[PDB]
Amino acid sequence: SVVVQLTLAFREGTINVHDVETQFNQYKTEAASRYNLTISDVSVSDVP
Amino acid sequence: SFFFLSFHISNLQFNSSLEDPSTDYYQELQRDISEMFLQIYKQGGFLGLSNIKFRPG
């Protein structure tokens, strides 16, 4: 498989790490149907 | 705030082109994934994402 690593940037007060993870996991269906990417094994961390 | 995200693309084979960020394939995948993330996060406060690192899984 292809491991993908990246960092997201939001302005202060916008979102927390759990919301980032849930919103991405909820998009898996559309990622497969629209982008033809089968997304798995999501990990999200706060970066200090 | 900043969030590090890692995931697998389970339906793509890692190949020699994806070891080299100057290749057309690397750049196409990085572009297309980036565009996808701009669709996932529509918050007014979402600014964008970093360049992408691909590794073999």
PDB file of N, CA and C in Angstrom:
ATOM      1  N   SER A   1       0.838  -1.185   0.000  1.00  0.00           N
ATOM      2  CA  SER A   1       0.000   0.000   0.000  1.00  0.00           C
ATOM      3  C   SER A   1       0.877   1.241   0.000  1.00  0.00           C
ATOM      4  N   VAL A   2       0.258   2.403  -0.131  1.00  0.00           N
ATOM      5  CA  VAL A   2       0.958   3.679  -0.059  1.00  0.00           C
ATOM      6  C   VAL A   2       0.606   4.322   1.272  1.00  0.00           C
ATOM      7  N   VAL A   3       1.625   4.582   2.090  1.00  0.00           N
ATOM      8  CA  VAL A   3       1.446   5.359   3.310  1.00  0.00           C
ATOM      9  C   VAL A   3       1.571   6.831   2.967  1.00  0.00           C
ATOM     10  N   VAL A   4       0.636   7.628   3.473  1.00  0.00           N
ATOM     11  CA  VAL A   4       0.551   9.049   3.182  1.00  0.00           C
ATOM     12  C   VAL A   4       0.663   9.793   4.500  1.00  0.00           C
ATOM     13  N   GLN A   5       1.570  10.767   4.567  1.00  0.00           N
ATOM     14  CA  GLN A   5       1.767  11.549   5.789  1.00  0.00           C
ATOM     15  C   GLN A   5       1.744  13.025   5.446  1.00  0.00           C
ATOM     16  N   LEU A   6       0.997  13.798   6.225  1.00  0.00           N
ATOM     17  CA  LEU A   6       0.832  15.219   5.958  1.00  0.00           C
ATOM     18  C   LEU A   6       0.384  15.909   7.238  1.00  0.00           C
ATOM     19  N   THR A   7       0.479  17.230   7.239  1.00  0.00           N
ATOM     20  CA  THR A   7       0.016  18.044   8.348  1.00  0.00           C
ATOM     21  C   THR A   7      -1.050  19.012   7.857  1.00  0.00           C
ATOM     22  N   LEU A   8      -2.127  19.117   8.624  1.00  0.00           N
ATOM     23  CA  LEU A   8      -3.207  20.056   8.373  1.00  0.00           C
ATOM     24  C   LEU A   8      -3.037  21.287   9.236  1.00  0.00           C
ATOM     25  N   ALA A   9      -3.472  22.424   8.702  1.00  0.00           N
ATOM     26  CA  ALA A   9      -3.393  23.702   9.401  1.00  0.00           C
ATOM     27  C   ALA A   9      -4.772  24.333   9.495  1.00  0.00           C
ATOM     28  N   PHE A  10      -5.174  24.686  10.721  1.00  0.00           N
ATOM     29  CA  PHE A  10      -6.400  25.426  10.985  1.00  0.00           C
ATOM     30  C   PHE A  10      -6.073  26.661  11.813  1.00  0.00           C
ATOM     31  N   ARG A  11      -6.885  27.698  11.659  1.00  0.00           N
ATOM     32  CA  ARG A  11      -6.756  28.830  12.563  1.00  0.00           C
ATOM     33  C   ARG A  11      -7.174  28.416  13.970  1.00  0.00           C
ATOM     34  N   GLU A  12      -6.687  29.174  14.949  1.00  0.00           N
ATOM     35  CA  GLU A  12      -6.966  28.899  16.353  1.00  0.00           C
ATOM     36  C   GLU A  12      -8.461  28.735  16.596  1.00  0.00           C
ATOM     37  N   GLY A  13      -8.801  27.784  17.463  1.00  0.00           N
ATOM     38  CA  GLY A  13     -10.160  27.602  17.931  1.00  0.00           C
ATOM     39  C   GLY A  13     -11.097  26.907  16.974  1.00  0.00           C
ATOM     40  N   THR A  14     -10.593  26.354  15.870  1.00  0.00           N
ATOM     41  CA  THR A  14     -11.478  25.841  14.830  1.00  0.00           C
ATOM     42  C   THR A  14     -11.932  24.412  15.119  1.00  0.00           C
ATOM     43  N   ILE A  15     -11.008  23.536  15.516  1.00  0.00           N
ATOM     44  CA  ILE A  15     -11.274  22.105  15.543  1.00  0.00           C
ATOM     45  C   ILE A  15     -10.324  21.458  16.543  1.00  0.00           C
ATOM     46  N   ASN A  16     -10.656  20.246  16.974  1.00  0.00           N
ATOM     47  CA  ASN A  16      -9.742  19.443  17.773  1.00  0.00           C
ATOM     48  C   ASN A  16      -9.422  18.126  17.071  1.00  0.00           C
ATOM     49  N   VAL A  17      -8.458  17.408  17.651  1.00  0.00           N
ATOM     50  CA  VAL A  17      -7.880  16.237  16.996  1.00  0.00           C
ATOM     51  C   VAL A  17      -8.930  15.165  16.758  1.00  0.00           C
ATOM     52  N   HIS A  18      -9.888  15.024  17.669  1.00  0.00           N
ATOM     53  CA  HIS A  18     -10.924  14.011  17.490  1.00  0.00           C
ATOM     54  C   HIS A  18     -11.815  14.347  16.305  1.00  0.00           C
ATOM     55  N   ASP A  19     -12.167  15.627  16.155  1.00  0.00           N
ATOM     56  CA  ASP A  19     -13.015  16.053  15.050  1.00  0.00           C
ATOM     57  C   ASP A  19     -12.304  15.858  13.725  1.00  0.00           C
ATOM     58  N   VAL A  20     -11.012  16.170  13.690  1.00  0.00           N
ATOM     59  CA  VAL A  20     -10.240  15.962  12.473  1.00  0.00           C
ATOM     60  C   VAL A  20     -10.297  14.493  12.073  1.00  0.00           C
ATOM     61  N   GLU A  21     -10.101  13.601  13.043  1.00  0.00           N
ATOM     62  CA  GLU A  21     -10.100  12.174  12.761  1.00  0.00           C
ATOM     63  C   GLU A  21     -11.481  11.687  12.332  1.00  0.00           C
ATOM     64  N   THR A  22     -12.525  12.082  13.059  1.00  0.00           N
ATOM     65  CA  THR A  22     -13.866  11.620  12.717  1.00  0.00           C
ATOM     66  C   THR A  22     -14.284  12.110  11.336  1.00  0.00           C
ATOM     67  N   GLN A  23     -13.985  13.370  11.013  1.00  0.00           N
ATOM     68  CA  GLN A  23     -14.397  13.911   9.723  1.00  0.00           C
ATOM     69  C   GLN A  23     -13.683  13.202   8.583  1.00  0.00           C
ATOM     70  N   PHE A  24     -12.426  12.826   8.792  1.00  0.00           N
ATOM     71  CA  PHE A  24     -11.724  12.082   7.762  1.00  0.00           C
ATOM     72  C   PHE A  24     -12.286  10.658   7.640  1.00  0.00           C
ATOM     73  N   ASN A  25     -12.493   9.968   8.768  1.00  0.00           N
ATOM     74  CA  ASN A  25     -13.026   8.612   8.682  1.00  0.00           C
ATOM     75  C   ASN A  25     -14.404   8.594   8.024  1.00  0.00           C
ATOM     76  N   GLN A  26     -15.227   9.607   8.297  1.00  0.00           N
ATOM     77  CA  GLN A  26     -16.545   9.669   7.691  1.00  0.00           C
ATOM     78  C   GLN A  26     -16.467   9.875   6.194  1.00  0.00           C
ATOM     79  N   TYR A  27     -15.361  10.420   5.700  1.00  0.00           N
ATOM     80  CA  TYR A  27     -15.201  10.665   4.276  1.00  0.00           C
ATOM     81  C   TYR A  27     -14.726   9.437   3.514  1.00  0.00           C
ATOM     82  N   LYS A  28     -14.421   8.332   4.194  1.00  0.00           N
ATOM     83  CA  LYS A  28     -13.867   7.181   3.487  1.00  0.00           C
ATOM     84  C   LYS A  28     -14.756   6.752   2.337  1.00  0.00           C
ATOM     85  N   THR A  29     -16.071   6.767   2.548  1.00  0.00           N
ATOM     86  CA  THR A  29     -16.963   6.287   1.507  1.00  0.00           C
ATOM     87  C   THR A  29     -16.848   7.150   0.259  1.00  0.00           C
ATOM     88  N   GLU A  30     -16.834   8.468   0.437  1.00  0.00           N
ATOM     89  CA  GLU A  30     -16.701   9.364  -0.704  1.00  0.00           C
ATOM     90  C   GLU A  30     -15.300   9.321  -1.302  1.00  0.00           C
ATOM     91  N   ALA A  31     -14.272   9.133  -0.477  1.00  0.00           N
ATOM     92  CA  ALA A  31     -12.932   8.991  -1.033  1.00  0.00           C
ATOM     93  C   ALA A  31     -12.870   7.817  -2.002  1.00  0.00           C
ATOM     94  N   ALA A  32     -13.519   6.707  -1.655  1.00  0.00           N
ATOM     95  CA  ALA A  32     -13.532   5.553  -2.545  1.00  0.00           C
ATOM     96  C   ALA A  32     -14.399   5.804  -3.775  1.00  0.00           C
ATOM     97  N   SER A  33     -15.607   6.336  -3.577  1.00  0.00           N
ATOM     98  CA  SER A  33     -16.550   6.446  -4.686  1.00  0.00           C
ATOM     99  C   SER A  33     -16.154   7.553  -5.655  1.00  0.00           C
ATOM    100  N   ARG A  34     -15.657   8.674  -5.144  1.00  0.00           N
ATOM    101  CA  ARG A  34     -15.354   9.837  -5.962  1.00  0.00           C
ATOM    102  C   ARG A  34     -13.890   9.917  -6.376  1.00  0.00           C
ATOM    103  N   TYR A  35     -12.958   9.625  -5.473  1.00  0.00           N
ATOM    104  CA  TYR A  35     -11.536   9.730  -5.776  1.00  0.00           C
ATOM    105  C   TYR A  35     -10.879   8.389  -6.083  1.00  0.00           C
ATOM    106  N   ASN A  36     -11.600   7.283  -5.938  1.00  0.00           N
ATOM    107  CA  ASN A  36     -11.030   5.964  -6.182  1.00  0.00           C
ATOM    108  C   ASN A  36      -9.816   5.720  -5.292  1.00  0.00           C
ATOM    109  N   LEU A  37      -9.869   6.239  -4.070  1.00  0.00           N
ATOM    110  CA  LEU A  37      -8.859   5.982  -3.056  1.00  0.00           C
ATOM    111  C   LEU A  37      -9.514   5.220  -1.915  1.00  0.00           C
ATOM    112  N   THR A  38      -8.964   4.055  -1.595  1.00  0.00           N
ATOM    113  CA  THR A  38      -9.453   3.219  -0.511  1.00  0.00           C
ATOM    114  C   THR A  38      -8.593   3.549   0.705  1.00  0.00           C
ATOM    115  N   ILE A  39      -9.155   4.332   1.628  1.00  0.00           N
ATOM    116  CA  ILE A  39      -8.395   4.947   2.714  1.00  0.00           C
ATOM    117  C   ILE A  39      -8.584   4.128   3.973  1.00  0.00           C
ATOM    118  N   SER A  40      -7.476   3.839   4.659  1.00  0.00           N
ATOM    119  CA  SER A  40      -7.495   2.969   5.825  1.00  0.00           C
ATOM    120  C   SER A  40      -6.468   3.453   6.845  1.00  0.00           C
ATOM    121  N   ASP A  41      -6.585   2.934   8.054  1.00  0.00           N
ATOM    122  CA  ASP A  41      -5.529   3.031   9.056  1.00  0.00           C
ATOM    123  C   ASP A  41      -5.181   4.480   9.375  1.00  0.00           C
ATOM    124  N   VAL A  42      -6.216   5.287   9.586  1.00  0.00           N
ATOM    125  CA  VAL A  42      -6.046   6.711   9.869  1.00  0.00           C
ATOM    126  C   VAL A  42      -5.509   6.909  11.280  1.00  0.00           C
ATOM    127  N   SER A  43      -4.508   7.779  11.400  1.00  0.00           N
ATOM    128  CA  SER A  43      -3.941   8.203  12.674  1.00  0.00           C
ATOM    129  C   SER A  43      -3.793   9.715  12.637  1.00  0.00           C
ATOM    130  N   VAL A  44      -4.213  10.383  13.711  1.00  0.00           N
ATOM    131  CA  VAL A  44      -4.179  11.838  13.787  1.00  0.00           C
ATOM    132  C   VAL A  44      -3.571  12.229  15.126  1.00  0.00           C
ATOM    133  N   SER A  45      -2.677  13.226  15.120  1.00  0.00           N
ATOM    134  CA  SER A  45      -1.998  13.684  16.334  1.00  0.00           C
ATOM    135  C   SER A  45      -1.992  15.205  16.372  1.00  0.00           C
ATOM    136  N   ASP A  46      -2.165  15.765  17.567  1.00  0.00           N
ATOM    137  CA  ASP A  46      -1.874  17.178  17.795  1.00  0.00           C
ATOM    138  C   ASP A  46      -0.373  17.419  17.712  1.00  0.00           C
ATOM    139  N   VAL A  47       0.027  18.469  17.015  1.00  0.00           N
ATOM    140  CA  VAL A  47       1.435  18.824  16.869  1.00  0.00           C
ATOM    141  C   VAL A  47       1.658  20.106  17.657  1.00  0.00           C
ATOM    142  N   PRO A  48       2.491  20.096  18.715  1.00  0.00           N
ATOM    143  CA  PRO A  48       2.680  21.228  19.641  1.00  0.00           C
ATOM    144  C   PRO A  48       3.504  22.384  19.085  1.00  0.00           C
TER     145      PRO A  48
ATOM    146  N   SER B   1      -4.022  25.907  14.808  1.00  0.00           N
ATOM    147  CA  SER B   1      -3.543  24.603  15.259  1.00  0.00           C
ATOM    148  C   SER B   1      -3.184  23.674  14.102  1.00  0.00           C
ATOM    149  N   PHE B   2      -2.317  22.722  14.403  1.00  0.00           N
ATOM    150  CA  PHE B   2      -1.757  21.808  13.424  1.00  0.00           C
ATOM    151  C   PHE B   2      -2.013  20.370  13.844  1.00  0.00           C
ATOM    152  N   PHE B   3      -2.262  19.521  12.858  1.00  0.00           N
ATOM    153  CA  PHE B   3      -2.581  18.119  13.090  1.00  0.00           C
ATOM    154  C   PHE B   3      -1.806  17.278  12.099  1.00  0.00           C
ATOM    155  N   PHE B   4      -1.054  16.316  12.614  1.00  0.00           N
ATOM    156  CA  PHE B   4      -0.354  15.349  11.787  1.00  0.00           C
ATOM    157  C   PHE B   4      -1.313  14.217  11.484  1.00  0.00           C
ATOM    158  N   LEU B   5      -1.401  13.847  10.214  1.00  0.00           N
ATOM    159  CA  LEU B   5      -2.297  12.792   9.787  1.00  0.00           C
ATOM    160  C   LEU B   5      -1.501  11.799   8.964  1.00  0.00           C
ATOM    161  N   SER B   6      -1.687  10.519   9.256  1.00  0.00           N
ATOM    162  CA  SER B   6      -1.137   9.438   8.457  1.00  0.00           C
ATOM    163  C   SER B   6      -2.278   8.505   8.078  1.00  0.00           C
ATOM    164  N   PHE B   7      -2.206   7.939   6.883  1.00  0.00           N
ATOM    165  CA  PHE B   7      -3.184   6.941   6.481  1.00  0.00           C
ATOM    166  C   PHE B   7      -2.574   6.094   5.387  1.00  0.00           C
ATOM    167  N   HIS B   8      -3.247   4.980   5.098  1.00  0.00           N
ATOM    168  CA  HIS B   8      -2.871   4.138   3.979  1.00  0.00           C
ATOM    169  C   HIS B   8      -3.851   4.330   2.844  1.00  0.00           C
ATOM    170  N   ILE B   9      -3.321   4.320   1.633  1.00  0.00           N
ATOM    171  CA  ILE B   9      -4.123   4.101   0.439  1.00  0.00           C
ATOM    172  C   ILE B   9      -3.936   2.634   0.093  1.00  0.00           C
ATOM    173  N   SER B  10      -4.969   1.850   0.359  1.00  0.00           N
ATOM    174  CA  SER B  10      -4.881   0.402   0.318  1.00  0.00           C
ATOM    175  C   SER B  10      -4.979  -0.173  -1.084  1.00  0.00           C
ATOM    176  N   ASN B  11      -5.351   0.632  -2.086  1.00  0.00           N
ATOM    177  CA  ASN B  11      -5.568   0.142  -3.444  1.00  0.00           C
ATOM    178  C   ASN B  11      -4.508   0.608  -4.428  1.00  0.00           C
ATOM    179  N   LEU B  12      -3.439   1.261  -3.961  1.00  0.00           N
ATOM    180  CA  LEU B  12      -2.341   1.700  -4.815  1.00  0.00           C
ATOM    181  C   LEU B  12      -1.049   1.014  -4.406  1.00  0.00           C
ATOM    182  N   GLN B  13      -0.324   0.523  -5.400  1.00  0.00           N
ATOM    183  CA  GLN B  13       0.975  -0.083  -5.167  1.00  0.00           C
ATOM    184  C   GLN B  13       2.031   1.003  -5.060  1.00  0.00           C
ATOM    185  N   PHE B  14       2.843   0.936  -4.018  1.00  0.00           N
ATOM    186  CA  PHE B  14       4.000   1.812  -3.951  1.00  0.00           C
ATOM    187  C   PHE B  14       5.011   1.351  -4.991  1.00  0.00           C
ATOM    188  N   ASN B  15       5.542   2.282  -5.784  1.00  0.00           N
ATOM    189  CA  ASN B  15       6.485   1.919  -6.835  1.00  0.00           C
ATOM    190  C   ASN B  15       7.628   2.924  -6.873  1.00  0.00           C
ATOM    191  N   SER B  16       8.581   2.677  -7.772  1.00  0.00           N
ATOM    192  CA  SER B  16       9.781   3.500  -7.802  1.00  0.00           C
ATOM    193  C   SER B  16       9.449   4.960  -8.064  1.00  0.00           C
ATOM    194  N   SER B  17       8.394   5.235  -8.838  1.00  0.00           N
ATOM    195  CA  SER B  17       8.026   6.621  -9.107  1.00  0.00           C
ATOM    196  C   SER B  17       7.654   7.354  -7.830  1.00  0.00           C
ATOM    197  N   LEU B  18       7.057   6.652  -6.868  1.00  0.00           N
ATOM    198  CA  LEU B  18       6.622   7.299  -5.640  1.00  0.00           C
ATOM    199  C   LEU B  18       7.754   7.488  -4.647  1.00  0.00           C
ATOM    200  N   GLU B  19       8.946   6.987  -4.955  1.00  0.00           N
ATOM    201  CA  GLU B  19      10.130   7.301  -4.170  1.00  0.00           C
ATOM    202  C   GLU B  19      10.742   8.642  -4.536  1.00  0.00           C
ATOM    203  N   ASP B  20      10.294   9.259  -5.622  1.00  0.00           N
ATOM    204  CA  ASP B  20      10.964  10.415  -6.207  1.00  0.00           C
ATOM    205  C   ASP B  20       9.948  11.535  -6.363  1.00  0.00           C
ATOM    206  N   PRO B  21       9.993  12.567  -5.511  1.00  0.00           N
ATOM    207  CA  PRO B  21       8.993  13.648  -5.582  1.00  0.00           C
ATOM    208  C   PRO B  21       9.024  14.474  -6.854  1.00  0.00           C
ATOM    209  N   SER B  22      10.005  14.283  -7.728  1.00  0.00           N
ATOM    210  CA  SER B  22      10.060  14.999  -8.988  1.00  0.00           C
ATOM    211  C   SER B  22       9.327  14.279 -10.112  1.00  0.00           C
ATOM    212  N   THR B  23       8.783  13.082  -9.868  1.00  0.00           N
ATOM    213  CA  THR B  23       8.137  12.357 -10.947  1.00  0.00           C
ATOM    214  C   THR B  23       6.709  12.848 -11.170  1.00  0.00           C
ATOM    215  N   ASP B  24       6.237  12.659 -12.399  1.00  0.00           N
ATOM    216  CA  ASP B  24       4.870  13.021 -12.739  1.00  0.00           C
ATOM    217  C   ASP B  24       3.873  12.293 -11.847  1.00  0.00           C
ATOM    218  N   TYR B  25       4.075  10.986 -11.612  1.00  0.00           N
ATOM    219  CA  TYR B  25       3.125  10.213 -10.812  1.00  0.00           C
ATOM    220  C   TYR B  25       3.083  10.715  -9.374  1.00  0.00           C
ATOM    221  N   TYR B  26       4.252  10.918  -8.767  1.00  0.00           N
ATOM    222  CA  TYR B  26       4.305  11.454  -7.414  1.00  0.00           C
ATOM    223  C   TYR B  26       3.535  12.770  -7.346  1.00  0.00           C
ATOM    224  N   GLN B  27       3.807  13.666  -8.290  1.00  0.00           N
ATOM    225  CA  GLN B  27       3.190  14.981  -8.256  1.00  0.00           C
ATOM    226  C   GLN B  27       1.688  14.897  -8.492  1.00  0.00           C
ATOM    227  N   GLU B  28       1.247  13.999  -9.375  1.00  0.00           N
ATOM    228  CA  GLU B  28      -0.182  13.832  -9.624  1.00  0.00           C
ATOM    229  C   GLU B  28      -0.899  13.332  -8.383  1.00  0.00           C
ATOM    230  N   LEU B  29      -0.331  12.325  -7.726  1.00  0.00           N
ATOM    231  CA  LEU B  29      -0.975  11.805  -6.533  1.00  0.00           C
ATOM    232  C   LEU B  29      -0.991  12.846  -5.420  1.00  0.00           C
ATOM    233  N   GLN B  30       0.129  13.539  -5.214  1.00  0.00           N
ATOM    234  CA  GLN B  30       0.153  14.587  -4.201  1.00  0.00           C
ATOM    235  C   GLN B  30      -0.868  15.674  -4.496  1.00  0.00           C
ATOM    236  N   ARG B  31      -0.964  16.090  -5.754  1.00  0.00           N
ATOM    237  CA  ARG B  31      -1.955  17.097  -6.126  1.00  0.00           C
ATOM    238  C   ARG B  31      -3.371  16.606  -5.845  1.00  0.00           C
ATOM    239  N   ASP B  32      -3.682  15.397  -6.302  1.00  0.00           N
ATOM    240  CA  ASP B  32      -5.050  14.910  -6.214  1.00  0.00           C
ATOM    241  C   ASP B  32      -5.455  14.696  -4.762  1.00  0.00           C
ATOM    242  N   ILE B  33      -4.533  14.197  -3.930  1.00  0.00           N
ATOM    243  CA  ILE B  33      -4.841  14.025  -2.518  1.00  0.00           C
ATOM    244  C   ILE B  33      -5.062  15.380  -1.868  1.00  0.00           C
ATOM    245  N   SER B  34      -4.211  16.350  -2.198  1.00  0.00           N
ATOM    246  CA  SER B  34      -4.360  17.689  -1.639  1.00  0.00           C
ATOM    247  C   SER B  34      -5.726  18.267  -1.977  1.00  0.00           C
ATOM    248  N   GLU B  35      -6.132  18.137  -3.245  1.00  0.00           N
ATOM    249  CA  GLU B  35      -7.437  18.629  -3.660  1.00  0.00           C
ATOM    250  C   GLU B  35      -8.554  17.934  -2.886  1.00  0.00           C
ATOM    251  N   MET B  36      -8.429  16.625  -2.677  1.00  0.00           N
ATOM    252  CA  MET B  36      -9.407  15.920  -1.863  1.00  0.00           C
ATOM    253  C   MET B  36      -9.516  16.528  -0.466  1.00  0.00           C
ATOM    254  N   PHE B  37      -8.391  16.788   0.192  1.00  0.00           N
ATOM    255  CA  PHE B  37      -8.465  17.370   1.530  1.00  0.00           C
ATOM    256  C   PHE B  37      -9.151  18.723   1.544  1.00  0.00           C
ATOM    257  N   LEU B  38      -8.974  19.536   0.505  1.00  0.00           N
ATOM    258  CA  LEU B  38      -9.684  20.814   0.435  1.00  0.00           C
ATOM    259  C   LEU B  38     -11.190  20.624   0.273  1.00  0.00           C
ATOM    260  N   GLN B  39     -11.627  19.447  -0.156  1.00  0.00           N
ATOM    261  CA  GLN B  39     -13.051  19.148  -0.187  1.00  0.00           C
ATOM    262  C   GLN B  39     -13.537  18.613   1.142  1.00  0.00           C
ATOM    263  N   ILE B  40     -12.684  17.894   1.871  1.00  0.00           N
ATOM    264  CA  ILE B  40     -13.101  17.293   3.134  1.00  0.00           C
ATOM    265  C   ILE B  40     -13.330  18.364   4.187  1.00  0.00           C
ATOM    266  N   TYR B  41     -12.412  19.322   4.291  1.00  0.00           N
ATOM    267  CA  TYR B  41     -12.437  20.345   5.336  1.00  0.00           C
ATOM    268  C   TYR B  41     -12.838  21.682   4.731  1.00  0.00           C
ATOM    269  N   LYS B  42     -14.054  22.119   5.032  1.00  0.00           N
ATOM    270  CA  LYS B  42     -14.586  23.363   4.501  1.00  0.00           C
ATOM    271  C   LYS B  42     -14.721  24.436   5.568  1.00  0.00           C
ATOM    272  N   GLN B  43     -14.177  24.205   6.760  1.00  0.00           N
ATOM    273  CA  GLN B  43     -14.287  25.187   7.826  1.00  0.00           C
ATOM    274  C   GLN B  43     -13.638  26.482   7.390  1.00  0.00           C
ATOM    275  N   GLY B  44     -14.234  27.597   7.806  1.00  0.00           N
ATOM    276  CA  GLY B  44     -13.637  28.882   7.510  1.00  0.00           C
ATOM    277  C   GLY B  44     -12.201  28.959   7.974  1.00  0.00           C
ATOM    278  N   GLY B  45     -11.895  28.318   9.088  1.00  0.00           N
ATOM    279  CA  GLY B  45     -10.561  28.332   9.641  1.00  0.00           C
ATOM    280  C   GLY B  45      -9.594  27.329   9.051  1.00  0.00           C
ATOM    281  N   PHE B  46     -10.027  26.449   8.142  1.00  0.00           N
ATOM    282  CA  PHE B  46      -9.116  25.489   7.527  1.00  0.00           C
ATOM    283  C   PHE B  46      -8.287  26.207   6.483  1.00  0.00           C
ATOM    284  N   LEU B  47      -6.967  26.180   6.657  1.00  0.00           N
ATOM    285  CA  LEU B  47      -6.070  26.881   5.755  1.00  0.00           C
ATOM    286  C   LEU B  47      -5.534  25.988   4.653  1.00  0.00           C
ATOM    287  N   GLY B  48      -5.251  24.737   4.952  1.00  0.00           N
ATOM    288  CA  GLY B  48      -4.722  23.827   3.962  1.00  0.00           C
ATOM    289  C   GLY B  48      -3.851  22.778   4.619  1.00  0.00           C
ATOM    290  N   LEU B  49      -2.964  22.206   3.813  1.00  0.00           N
ATOM    291  CA  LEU B  49      -2.137  21.098   4.248  1.00  0.00           C
ATOM    292  C   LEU B  49      -0.717  21.282   3.740  1.00  0.00           C
ATOM    293  N   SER B  50       0.191  20.524   4.335  1.00  0.00           N
ATOM    294  CA  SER B  50       1.586  20.538   3.954  1.00  0.00           C
ATOM    295  C   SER B  50       1.783  19.770   2.658  1.00  0.00           C
ATOM    296  N   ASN B  51       3.007  19.828   2.158  1.00  0.00           N
ATOM    297  CA  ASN B  51       3.387  18.836   1.174  1.00  0.00           C
ATOM    298  C   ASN B  51       3.266  17.443   1.785  1.00  0.00           C
ATOM    299  N   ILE B  52       3.164  16.457   0.907  1.00  0.00           N
ATOM    300  CA  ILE B  52       2.848  15.096   1.300  1.00  0.00           C
ATOM    301  C   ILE B  52       4.090  14.225   1.209  1.00  0.00           C
ATOM    302  N   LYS B  53       4.233  13.342   2.189  1.00  0.00           N
ATOM    303  CA  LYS B  53       5.264  12.313   2.198  1.00  0.00           C
ATOM    304  C   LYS B  53       4.615  10.970   1.906  1.00  0.00           C
ATOM    305  N   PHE B  54       5.112  10.275   0.886  1.00  0.00           N
ATOM    306  CA  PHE B  54       4.679   8.914   0.578  1.00  0.00           C
ATOM    307  C   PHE B  54       5.748   7.934   1.040  1.00  0.00           C
ATOM    308  N   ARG B  55       5.314   6.821   1.620  1.00  0.00           N
ATOM    309  CA  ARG B  55       6.199   5.745   2.035  1.00  0.00           C
ATOM    310  C   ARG B  55       5.564   4.419   1.651  1.00  0.00           C
ATOM    311  N   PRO B  56       6.365   3.363   1.509  1.00  0.00           N
ATOM    312  CA  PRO B  56       5.787   2.038   1.263  1.00  0.00           C
ATOM    313  C   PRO B  56       5.075   1.502   2.496  1.00  0.00           C
ATOM    314  N   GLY B  57       3.874   0.969   2.282  1.00  0.00           N
ATOM    315  CA  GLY B  57       3.138   0.272   3.322  1.00  0.00           C
ATOM    316  C   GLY B  57       2.950  -1.208   3.026  1.00  0.00           C
TER     317      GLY B  57
END
